[PDB]
């Protein structure tokens, strides 16, 4: 018995995503806006190809 399919993954855009390497949340002061929402703010702050 067999299965067949045509597919492959894609990269949407280089500046619409982020991944960080820490998640502690101790008292919601280690990462609240230090590394968890720091990336949120980094995404908020970006420039296109026109300055």
């Amino acid at each position: 018995f067999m299965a067949d399919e045509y597919r492959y993954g894609v990269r949407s855009r280089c500046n619409v995503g982020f991944g960080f390497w820490q998640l502690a949340a101790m008292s919601t002061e280690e990462l609240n806006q230090v590394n968890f929402e720091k990336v949120y703010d980094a995404m908020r702050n970006q420039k296109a190809d026109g300055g």
Binding site: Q33, E37, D41, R44, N45
Partner: protein, 50 residues
Amino acid sequence: RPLDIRPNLLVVPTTLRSKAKEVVGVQRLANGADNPNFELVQVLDTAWLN
């Protein structure tokens, strides 16, 4: 003769939005303290500056 000033706007970069909203936007402070500066000034966040 002093001047009547009624600050109602707070403009900050996207990097200070978290702090701006936690000053104006948080209703309780600590283990319950109200917030004397809650909704005192409305905040707008912009990406043109900084």
